[PDB]
Structure formats: C-alpha cells, structure tokens
Design a protein around this ligand. Structure first.
Ligand SMILES: CC(=O)c1csc(NC(=O)[C@@H]2CNCCN2)n1
Length: 130
C-alpha cells in the first residue's frame, strides 16, 4: 500500500543516516569501500561474501532492506568478514578486529537508542505479509 511504502521510505532515510555516521568515522575508513585486489590480493580468496559501507548504501537505495534486521545482517557481515580475515595476533590484525567490533557495537547502539521498537515491528509485519 501507499502507507506501507511511506513506512519503508522512513526506514531507508533512517538507515542512510546511520550508515553515513559510520562512514565518516575515521576508525571505520577500512570498511567504507570494497577491498582493492591490487592492494590486498589474497582477500577475494579468503572472504567469499565481501561487504562494505558503500555497498550497504547501494542496497538501501535498491530497496533491499525492509527491516533493520536485514540491515544489521550486513553490518554483522562487515564485522565477521574482518574478524575472519584478521585472525592473527599481529598488531595490524588486532587493530582491524578492534575497529570491526567497534563498528558493530556502534551500529547496534545507535539503533537501540534511536529506532522505535514499534516502528521496527511494523516493518517486520509488512515484510512477513509479502
Ligand atoms: C577489510 C579488511 O578486513 C581488511 C582490509 S586489509 C586487512 N588486513 C591487512 O591489511 C593485514 C592482514 N594480516 C596482515 C597484517 N594486516 N583486512
């Protein structure tokens, strides 16, 4: 319905705002763009499903997210891909793991503070109806 499309549009506006606040954070620069194969050649080999904040923005605009849970699955994928690719005790790995966990924690905390639980519930019920 037209009312339901307004609901999903509000969700997209919210998700773009959260994603922008993550993308401008200096700690998360490594997560803002796909990994360059010329720079990191073993990445495409270890990580089967890459995800980054620019790809998240594109999926918002393609109406791929109908609930915040769909969005958080891709935030969680950014984080879990980073932990998987950086498992070593080396400081370069430890730094990215710390940033990856901060990205995930920050996104969850913004959503917990700013997304109305009834709004998310409405989104889920519209989605379950289609
Ligand atoms: C996006 C992401 O997770 C990513 C991008 S570069 C990188 N890891 C490194 O550059 C290496 C890995 N181990 C050797 C020392 N640091 N991880």
């Amino acid at each position: 319905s037209m009312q339901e499309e307004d609901t999903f549009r509000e969700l997209r506006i919210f998700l773009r705002n959260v994603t922008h606040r993550l993308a401008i954070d200096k700690r998360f620069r490594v997560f803002t763009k796909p990994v360059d194969p010329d720079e990191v050649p073993d990445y495409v080999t270890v990580i089967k499903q890459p995800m980054d904040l620019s790809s998240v923005i594109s999926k918002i605009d393609l109406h791929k997210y109908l609930t915040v849970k769909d969005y958080l699955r891709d935030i969680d994928l950014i984080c879990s891909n980073a932990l998987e690719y950086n498992p070593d005790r080396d400081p370069g790995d430890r730094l990215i793991r710390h940033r990856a966990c901060a990205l995930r924690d920050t996104a969850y905390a913004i959503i917990k503070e700013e997304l109305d639980e009834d709004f998310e519930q409405l989104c889920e019920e519209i989605q379950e109806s289609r």
